[PDB]
Amino acid sequence: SSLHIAMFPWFAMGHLIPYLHLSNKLAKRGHKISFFTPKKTQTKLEQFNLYPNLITFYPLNVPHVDGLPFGAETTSDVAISLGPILMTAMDQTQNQIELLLTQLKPQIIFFDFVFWLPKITQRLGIKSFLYFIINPATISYTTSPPRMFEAENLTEVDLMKPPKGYPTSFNLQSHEAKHLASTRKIEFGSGIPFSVRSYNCLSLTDAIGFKGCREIEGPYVDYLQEQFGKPVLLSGPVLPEQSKTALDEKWGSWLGGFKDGSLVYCALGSELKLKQDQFHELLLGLELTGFPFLAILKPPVGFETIEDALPEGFKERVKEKGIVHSGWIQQQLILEHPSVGCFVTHCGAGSITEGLVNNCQMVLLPQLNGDYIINARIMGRHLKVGVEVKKGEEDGLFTKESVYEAVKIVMDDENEIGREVRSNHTKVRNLLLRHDLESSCLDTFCEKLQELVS
């Protein structure tokens, strides 16, 4: 029998998009989806709804919080330092969420962050499902019980090593462990420290799920199920679904002028702005390669346009071989274009999946966020499907020569590291795209969801 599932992701394109990809896969199996989205944002999500008779959007009015830019609904509308105020606003949707649950009566609700929800749902006889679209390796590293009983005695040297029990080994740099130790204590919505919020969610939910498959995420899902004593499910790798909107003819024509596999695509997601020094180093490093390139970047901190921030003489030298562009583009469609030979990525979980299912060589340029950092280590050191750009151990900055070197290595057909990461990427792509991999993951997923509502 088909399930009625409500979807309540965090107000960010990096959560909305994979929740919608998964919604389409569940609707294809006959399940009914009630998708809660900020009101104005719904118009940009319609293109991804492939089953309008089963997936219905329900708008949320994102309420005012002191400091929130007017009319802001998602992390694409606010600076990254304003995220905690946006999460206060999400907390404040509780009244209209409770209204929607009592009228719609879903059997399950998938959610992020809102640890007050499981109390509402169990009063209504609804199962709460904490569904992560980031890597369970990240949650396993930062928010497993061993980390949380240390409370404020958790130091940067503590975060250099993995918690007790952790299933794999990798190294963080000093500045990364320092970032994890500080941001963990920062208030993220309604005065709750970030790690306390997420540990409340893990503790109070009925079940937990992650994007991923047994072959890659399995060891971390096992570790978390042992730690938290409740079901920890895998949805499958959430392979991107096809949009109802074809590739913008302006990008299609320009990309089509380049030799197959010759172009470097660089994008750092939907939220962040580089400091001007690192913006310059990145662009000068791409220029050094002599390859054509498309860099999708916001203007650096303190600047409002790309043109004002470009290194001197840059546009004149680069001419028609390279473009630096600030707007939202159809990244998934660009990564499938045959001209793209290299993807320089901030290692967001969605961008990683999009890169892995395509042919591009991966250059890892993780920005300062726990999931990006841990994704980069797993891709660089465990799966060995990409080359990571060297950063300063203490300052977290890169040089233009390190960007240049990483791209050169993966683009050079005779470079044995480049050939090795290409071969490993092919192995991972062949796994993710195996004819029965996603379908058997979703088979198990749906059986376990049925168990949950039984």
Annotated binding site for UDP: 270, 328-329, 331, 346, 350-351, 354, 372
Shortest Cβ 15–ligand UDP spacing (Å)? 7
Chain breaks in the chain (C to N over 2.5 A) after: none
Query: Whose Cβ is closer to ligand UDP: residue 34's or residue 367's?
Result: 367
Q: Which of 105, 107, 110, 135 is nearest to 37 (CA)?
A: 110
How many binding residues for ligand UDP (CB under 6 A)?
18
Q: Is 147 exposed, middle or buried (0-12, 13-18, 19+ CB in 10 A)?
A: buried
24 scored as a contact of ligand UDP (CB under 6 A): no
Site string for ligand UDP, 338-357 (x = CB under 6 A): ----------xxxx--x---
Binder to ligand UDP among 6, 11, 14, 391 (CB under 6 A)? 14
Rg (CA), the chain: 22
Shortest Cβ 362–ligand UDP spacing (Å)? 13
Shortest Cβ 16–ligand UDP spacing (Å)? 9
Query: Whose Cβ is closer to ligand UDP: residue 204's or residue 357's?
Result: 357
Shortest Cβ 371–ligand UDP spacing (Å)? 8
Give the range of 37-45, 84-92, 99-107, 266-274 binding ligand UDP by CB under 6 A. Answer: 266-274
299 scored as a contact of ligand UDP (CB under 6 A): no
Q: Which of 20, 10, 8 is nearest to 45 (CA)?
A: 20
Q: What whole-number distance in Å separates Cα of residue 415 and Cα of residue 413?
A: 6
Give the range of 275-283, 323-331, 380-388, 431-439 binding ligand UDP by CB under 6 A. Answer: 323-331
Question: How many CB atoms within 10 Å of residue 209?
Answer: 24
Return the C-alpha torsion angle 414, 415, 417, 422, nearest 10: -40
Determine the Cα angle at 144 with ends 142 and 149, to 5°. Answer: 95
Give the range of 102-110, 166-174, 268-276, 391-399 binding ligand UDP by CB under 6 A. Answer: 268-276
- Decide if 394 contacts 174 (C-beta within 8 A): yes
Which residues have a catalytic role annotated?
15, 112
Query: Whose Cβ is closer to ligand UDP: residue 126's or residue 134's?
Result: 134
Binder to ligand UDP among 74, 142, 331, 361 (CB under 6 A)? 331
- Decide if 34 contacts 58 (C-beta within 8 A): yes
Return the C-alpha torsion angle 420, 421, 426, 429, nearest 10: 160
List contacts with ligand UDP (CB under 6 A).
12-14, 17, 267, 269-271, 296, 328-329, 331-332, 348-351, 354
